[PDB]
Amino acid sequence: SSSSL
Amino acid sequence: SSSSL
Amino acid sequence: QQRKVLTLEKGDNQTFGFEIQTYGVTFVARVHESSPAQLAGLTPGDTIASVNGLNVEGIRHREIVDIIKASGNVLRLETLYGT
Amino acid sequence: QQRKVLTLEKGDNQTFGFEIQTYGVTFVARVHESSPAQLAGLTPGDTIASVNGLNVEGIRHREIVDIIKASGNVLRLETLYGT
């Protein structure tokens, strides 16, 4: 999964 | 490297 | 979930709309909105297993990219949930 | 090239502007334009080595993300050219 920061 | 397609 | 089969179809002068990266496996770093890739169901995090029916685990990045660039406007992919 | 040290500084209600993915290493899948990340020099393809001085090779994704979410508006990272 890709996580936005 | 990231490649656009 | 399990596997995932999909077919992208693009315009003649547009892109499929996704970026890939390879480490060492190849996976989708980005998927542009409204692109054949998104509308097809491609999701960042997916990993590319096959391209037009061919497995890529043993192929280098530039090659994979080359195959996709030479696939015309239609594209058959197979991905597996990466992360 | 070699290593790469950088410091991101953000607004109080904005994001640093980048996405990360982890496989098994953790790397930048995307960098939003005009974000502290881009202006700082972050580039898709970079891999995260340290965060605020801590190495992440042995930490899980959700943790890394947690550390970054708790770093306030300043952020010190260290990346290595991934791909």
UniProtKB/Swiss-Prot annotation, chains C, D:
Keywords from UniProt, A to Z, are:
Cell membrane, Cytoplasm, Membrane, Methylation, Phosphoprotein, Postsynaptic cell membrane, Synapse
Q: Which GO terms describe its molecular function?
A: identical protein binding; PDZ domain binding; small GTPase binding
Tissues with expression: Expressed in brain.
Q: State whether keyword Secreted applies.
A: no
GO terms under cellular component: glutamatergic synapse; perinuclear region of cytoplasm; plasma membrane; postsynaptic density; postsynaptic membrane
Question: The PDZ domain covers which part of the protein?
Answer: 5-83
Summarizing the function annotation, the protein's role is: Plays a role in intracellular trafficking and contributes to the macromolecular organization of group 1 metabotropic glutamate receptors (mGluRs) at synapses.
Assembly: Heteromer. Composed of TAMALIN, CYTH2 and at least one GRM1. Also interacts with CYTH3, GRM2, GRM3 and GRM5.
Protein's name according to its UniProt entry: General receptor for phosphoinositides 1-associated scaffold protein
